């Protein structure tokens, strides 16, 4: 089962109208280190909710 007609660049764009990525709405800010991090994840410098949880 293959197309009988070449679908248009318009239908291609129409189908891709749902492909847009969602940006992360907002980053959270660690209360201790003040550096931005993904919500409920550890900071890239090992903090989490103001506590240092890992030494990396």
């Amino acid at each position: 089962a293959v197309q009988q007609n070449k679908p248009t660049r318009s239908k291609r764009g129409m189908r891709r109208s749902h492909d847009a990525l969602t940006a992360v709405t907002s980053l959270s800010v660690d209360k201790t280190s003040g550096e931005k991090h993904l919500r409920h994840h550890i900071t890239a410098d090992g903090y989490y909710r103001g506590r240092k949880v890992i030494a990396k």
């Binding site: 847009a20 990525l21 940006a23 992360v24 931005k36 993904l38």
Partner: protein, 110 residues
């Protein structure tokens, strides 16, 4: 003024990079850097390197201030396609296209 950074012949289809590029079009560069930092795409890494290169071009070549810069232009063009053979069943060959893209990021304060 406007400062450009290009990553030409990036190894990724422009369609994939364009998702990320649309994600940070028109944003302030700090906000764009955050968005790219948390966007789980290979294209986000490439676009982030281009954006950081653009910011450094602006601050160094054009004496801009990072806090003023916005991503005023972030198109992704198609670059040349590398052409490769995928052997398929029954002796058939397909040619796959390893599509490259050119990423252009323009930052400016205006």
């Amino acid at each position: 003024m406007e400062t450009i950074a290009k990553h030409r012949h990036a190894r990724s289809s422009a369609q994939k990079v364009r998702l990320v590029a649309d994600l940070i079009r028109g944003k302030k560069v700090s906000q764009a850097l955050d968005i790219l930092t948390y966007t789980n795409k290979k294209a986000a890494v490439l676009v982030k390197k281009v954006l950081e290169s653009a910011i450094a071009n602006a601050e160094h070549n054009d004496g801009a201030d990072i806090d003023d810069l916005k991503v005023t232009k972030i198109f992704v063009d198609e670059g040349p396609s590398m052409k490769r053979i995928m052997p398929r069943a029954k002796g058939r060959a397909d040619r796959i296209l390893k599509r490259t893209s050119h990423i252009t990021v323009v930052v400016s304060d205006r």
